């Protein structure tokens, strides 16, 4: 029986503490949604490892989740260990219901804790307390009345971890009513204890003692546990999570990492609420297949079998001197075949013989006495050891021997070999002396001719096949590896593996170590063959060295992840994008499927769609092509509606799955070439927008020493030893700081002096109500200013962050005076005119202030004052709806949160690099300072300084680039401030999308917001037009407008609003006659 661990198994990792923190870590955890074995009882013949025991002993496996349920206190302790017997150490932890006693005692084997003795028995479990090595007492780990006073059922979740000799133990207690299976809902497991044990735990079993049941009708033997209390078991696996800590500091919730692609996004982007968007996550190139591959063909050979099988060897004294080279060797047959009587190798391992290489190999072979065999070795003394062939005390290959009483010995007697007694030139090792040493001086008292006149040191050595050792001829050949003297020449039999096709293989062609996929290529290498290349070691093409076919080697051939999520708050489905993999290769490590059972992860779904950038595993390609959304690559995007064909679908396309159409930037809105008939404004819209520019960043400074050293004088010594980097760094940060102040001054302080917000605000129906600062409400930030200062993430994720060396000097202009500047800008903008920057500000009423700002797009003051009422009310409505969208859309201000988050990341990663040892024996400073002597300290710490310095350097540079681009933005900002707050610019699509009216500064935490109020026309209409009228034999041409016809009467109108007029002299300019011109018409002038 299997049940899912829906949410259990989570415990606070270490006694560390945090508050409202989304911390993450990887410890041995019970995976989410895992099948667990519902042990209940004997379930007769349901026991496989134990006998008459309900729930047999099980493997430990480095961690188990445990939980026992009951309606009354029943379940006893546990047994941990490897043998659970006196043989090998094991652990026992029992609940006495009066106290808990923890013992590692080696108890005798009890097949059951409850041998039948049902309850009157006295602790049957304690078979023997021999070698009790540990003991401890504490308050019981108790259970019930939860189970009956509440009449619920009670719980105790447990985790028995053996981590580094420390046996961490956790617990909780909880009522339950739905007694059938483990419920949903969340919890945690605080520990109780650590135990420095150090035992090896491989098996463990639960303990329960049958007091008295009634399962069987015996009235005493009724004690039975087939239908009694039960418990589940899981196993913990090394998976990381992301925790969610409480205000009080509790584990409120937790999320997986390898369960879903979705959870893996969560843990990439540390949060519980991701928004719609592709999140490059963790790439997965390949696991290469087996091994080296060359071929089974051409190779060469030394004639070893020539000389070894040569059944005629020579005198030991007249030992052969044979040099062999320029081949391929093989020492397998000699070393393994039973031909030799003796195999013994001196400073050369017989195993590695083939893979070694030698310039020259010498074979010195002969026949030896059986008893003399011992004297061929470095460090041997004797007649032959001194006077026939002497080994030196150095690297000699081997000393081989094999009897040849069959071949060397003959029954007719064989005296043919020899052994000189004691009388040649003493044999500096390797001297082939063969001289006839009859006399020495013919007079010497030792040998001479006096005393000895019938001696000859050569003593020919008779023998016979059946004569005995000593008279036993052993054939001996020695392989003299002459090596390293020159280029190596002799190596064993390599080129020994078949080649492979079209699968990621770690290949080696004649020393070319690499990994790739082999393919049939189509060029021809010249005998300069051996390999090809594209650039600078890209050994892209290669041929086999042994049969001469050429091949291509393309890379390990691919991996990818680009998970798509439409947003947790509004869906929970996920589909994975694989960057550039023809998922014929079933993308992940082809068909990874060694992972958690998860159809996206278990990527085989029929819902697939290959594109330029690989394929989507959760893919439902359509051909209908809406507007783009979360972008995939090369056009294609996602995110249609909930109801394309089926109701079960969500705005996440094809709910629980995802489609990917091809981007279609919209529809078509063409007109065709007109004859001359214009489509021209009859009605329109004045409207409004937004824009958000960062204009600064939060100031920062970093005392270089304190960041690096932080009061460790030796660090300060070495840091002043590295020249003046610190000065440069501090200076650059100071420069960008004062630069920030300059930007603020340039953006806001353009005007010379404040003109107050007029007390009586009665602006021509153009209600503000929202832009001018608070009437007298606190801080004098305007209502829109208020929401700008509040809807901005007031957390900022919580930068309120100076710990060591960090600091923040505050800005110069403060938000009160900044808002004062802004308000002044407003006041000049509205009362003065476009002149509160060109000298002393003048004054003009707002009706004219916008009539001659209409005149800035080509419409006179009849237009407004004729429609001053409705145009004004449109302004009020539009600017009110500003409040709406600025108040409503989440991520509306994304630019300034982007900036502040960027600096947040910068500093946060900076201190995290602070916590890194960069090759040092530790990351923290004072211990490595104080754990070692002077020299090794200073060198390792110096490694730390250099790493810290480079990190700080990267931060400073990155800040410089960010600062410069913000400078450009700020210059643009003040430029806009000037062109369309101190005037009305015309550079198209700079002061708002459309014909511009005006711009309104609004403060910001670090940026600025404009309100580009633009003129976007509407309601086009078609009429007849003519570039001239020939009147009185004479063409006409318009001064202030154009001639338009209704089809029957001609009318004079302007170019961005239909305002027709009669044809009159004073608006029409008159030259030549009807010239060579197209479109001229009748119906002449008054």
């Amino acid at each position: 029986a299997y049940t899912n661990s829906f949410t259990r198994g989570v415990y606070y990792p270490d006694k560390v503490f945090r508050s409202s923190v989304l911390h993450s870590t990887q410890d041995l955890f019970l995976p989410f949604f895992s099948n667990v074995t519902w042990f209940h009882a004997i379930h007769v013949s349901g026991t496989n490892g134990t006998k008459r025991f309900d729930n047999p002993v099980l493997p430990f496996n480095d961690g188990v989740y445990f939980a026992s349920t009951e309606k009354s206190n029943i379940i006893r302790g546990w047994i941990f260990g490897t043998t659970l017997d006196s043989k090998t150490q094991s652990l026992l932890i029992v609940n006495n219901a009066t106290n808990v006693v923890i013992k590692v005692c080696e108890f005798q084997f009890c097949n059951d804790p409850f041998l039948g003795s049902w309850m009157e028995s006295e602790f049957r479990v304690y078979s023997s307390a021999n070698n009790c090595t540990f003991e401890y007492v504490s308050q019981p780990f108790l259970m019930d009345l939860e189970g009956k006073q509440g009449n619920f059922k009670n719980l105790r979740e447990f985790v028995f971890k053996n981590i580094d000799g420390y046996f961490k133990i956790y617990s909780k207690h909880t009522p339950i009513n739905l007694v059938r299976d483990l419920p949903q809902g969340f919890s945690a497991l605080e520990p109780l204890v650590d135990l420095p044990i150090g035992i090896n735990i491989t098996r463990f079993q639960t303990l329960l003692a049958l007091h008295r049941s009634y399962l069987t009708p015996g009235d005493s033997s009724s004690g039975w546990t087939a239908g009694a209390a039960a418990y589940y078991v899981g196993y913990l696996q090394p998976r990381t999570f992301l925790l969610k800590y409480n205000e009080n500091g509790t584990i409120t919730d937790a999320v997986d990492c390898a369960l879903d692609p979705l959870s893996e996004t969560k843990c990439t982007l540390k949060s519980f609420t991701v928004e719609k968007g592709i999140y490059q996550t963790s790439n997965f190139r390949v696991q290469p297949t087996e091994s080296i591959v060359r071929f089974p063909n051409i190779t060469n050979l030394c004639p070893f079998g020539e000389v070894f099988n040569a059944t005629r060897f020579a005198s030991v004294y007249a030992w052969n001197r044979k040099r062999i080279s320029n081949c391929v060797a093989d020492y397998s047959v000699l070393y393994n075949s039973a031909s030799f009587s003796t195999f013994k190798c001196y400073g050369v391992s017989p195993t590695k013989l083939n893979d070694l290489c030698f310039t020259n190999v010498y074979a010195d072979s002969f026949v030896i006495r059986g008893d003399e065999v011992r004297q061929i070795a470095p460090g041997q003394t004797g007649k032959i050891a001194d006077y026939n062939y002497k080994l030196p005390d150095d690297f000699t290959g081997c000393v081989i021997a094999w009897n040849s009483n069959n071949l060397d010995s003959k029954v007719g007697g064989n005296y043919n070999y020899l052994y000189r007694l004691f009388r040649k030139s003493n044999l500096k090792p390797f001297e082939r002396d063969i001289s006839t040493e009859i006399y020495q001086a013919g007079s010497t008292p030792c040998n001479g001719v006096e005393g000895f006149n019938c001696y000859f040191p050569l003593q020919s050595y008779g023998f016979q096949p059946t004569n005995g050792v000593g008279y036993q001829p052993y054939r001996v050949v020695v392989l003299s590896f002459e090596l390293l003297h020159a280029p190596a020449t002799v190596c064993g039999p390599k080129k020994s593996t078949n080649l492979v096709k079209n699968k990621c293989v770690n290949f080696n062609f004649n020393g070319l170590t690499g990994t790739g996929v082999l393919t049939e290529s189509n060029k021809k290498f010249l005998p300069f063959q051996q390999f090809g290349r594209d650039i600078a070691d890209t050994t892209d093409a290669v041929r086999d060295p042994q049969t001469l076919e050429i091949l291509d080697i393309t890379p390990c051939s691919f991996g990818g992840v680009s998970v798509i999520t439409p947003g947790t708050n509004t869906s929970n489905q996920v589909a994975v994008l694989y960057q550039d993999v023809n998922c014929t290769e079933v993308p992940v490590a082809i068909h990874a499927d060694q992972l958690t059972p998860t159809w996206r992860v278990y990527s085989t779904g029929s819902n697939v769609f290959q594109t330029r950038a690989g394929c989507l595993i959760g893919a439902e390609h359509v051909n209908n092509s809406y507007e783009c959304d979360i972008p995939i690559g090369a056009g294609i995007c996602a995110s249609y509606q909930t109801q394309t064909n089926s109701p079960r679908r969500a705005r996440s396309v094809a709910s629980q799955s995802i489609i990917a159409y091809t981007m279609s930037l919209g529809a078509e809105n063409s007109v065709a070439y007109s004859n001359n008939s214009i489509a021209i404004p009859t009605n329109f819209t004045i409207s409004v927008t937004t824009e958000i520019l960062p204009v600064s960043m939060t100031k920062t400074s970093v005392d270089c020493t304190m960041y690096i050293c932080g009061d460790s004088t030796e660090c300060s010594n070495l840091l002043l030893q590295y020249g003046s980097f610190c000065t440069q760094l501090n200076r650059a940060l100071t420069g960008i700081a004062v630069e920030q102040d300059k930007n603020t001054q340039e953006v806001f302080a353009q005007v010379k002096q404040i003109y107050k917000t007029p007390p009586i605000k009665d602006f021509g129906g153009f209600n503000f109500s929202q832009i001018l600062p608070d009437p007298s409400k606190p801080s004098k930030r305007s209502f829109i200013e208020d929401l700008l200062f509040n809807k901005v993430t007031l957390a900022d994720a919580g930068f309120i962050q100076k710990f060591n060396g960090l600091t923040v000097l505050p800005p110069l202009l403060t938000d009160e005076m900044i808002a004062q500047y802004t308000s002044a800008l407003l006041a000049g903008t509205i009362t003065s005119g476009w002149t509160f920057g060109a000298g002393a500000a003048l004054q003009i009423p707002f009706a004219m202030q916008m009539a001659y700002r209409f005149n800035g797009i080509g419409v006179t003051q009849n237009v407004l004052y004729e429609n001053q009422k409705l145009i004004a009310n449109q302004f009020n409505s539009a600017i009110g709806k500003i409040q709406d969208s600025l108040s409503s859309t989440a991520s509306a201000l994304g630019k300034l949160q982007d900036v502040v988050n960027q600096n947040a990341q910068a500093l946060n990663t900076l201190v995290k690099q602070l916590s890194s040892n960069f090759g040092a024996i530790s990351s923290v400073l004072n211990d490595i300072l104080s754990r070692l002597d002077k020299v090794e300290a200073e060198v390792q710490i110096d490694r730390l300084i250099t790493g810290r310095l480079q990190s700080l350097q990267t931060y400073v540079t990155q800040q410089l680039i960010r600062a410069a681009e913000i400078r450009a933005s700020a210059n643009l900002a003040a430029t806009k401030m000037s062109e369309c707050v101190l005037g009305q610019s015309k550079r198209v699509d700079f002061c708002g999308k459309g014909y511009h009216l005006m711009s309104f500064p609004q403060s910001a935490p670090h940026g600025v917001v404009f309100l580009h109020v633009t003129y976007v026309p509407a309601q086009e209409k078609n009429f007849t037009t003519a570039p001239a009228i020939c009147h009185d034999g004479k063409a006409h041409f318009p001064r202030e407008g154009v001639f338009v016809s209704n089809g029957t009467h001609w009318f004079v109108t302007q170019r961005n609003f239909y305002e027709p007029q009669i044809i009159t002299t004073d608006n029409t300019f008159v030259s030549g006659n009807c010239d060579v011109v197209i479109g001229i018409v009748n119906n002449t002038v008054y």
Partner: nanobody
Amino acid sequence: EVQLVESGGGQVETGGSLRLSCQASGSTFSDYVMAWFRQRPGKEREFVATISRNGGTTTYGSSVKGRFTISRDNAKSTVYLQMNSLKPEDTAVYYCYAVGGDGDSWGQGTQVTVSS
């Protein structure tokens, strides 16, 4: 080319003289030192006389050495052996036995039967 073919040996009376020779199969003869041995039937090989690489250095055995005469002849590709003051105890198959290169060097085996 060391196919040493013993030559010159033949039946001899007790006290006579004969030439003994041997030839490698068309090679150098200086460096290949010859040795000559006696193997009476009813026993095995023994040694009477030999020579050096020079050939001038007529190093015979330790037994009576004025018996035999030796000469390596590089100009005629054969050794030359003149045995003299003979005794019937040399009825044996001799071997020219050019030491250089192959030590146990022979391949014809020259018979010298010492008659009555």
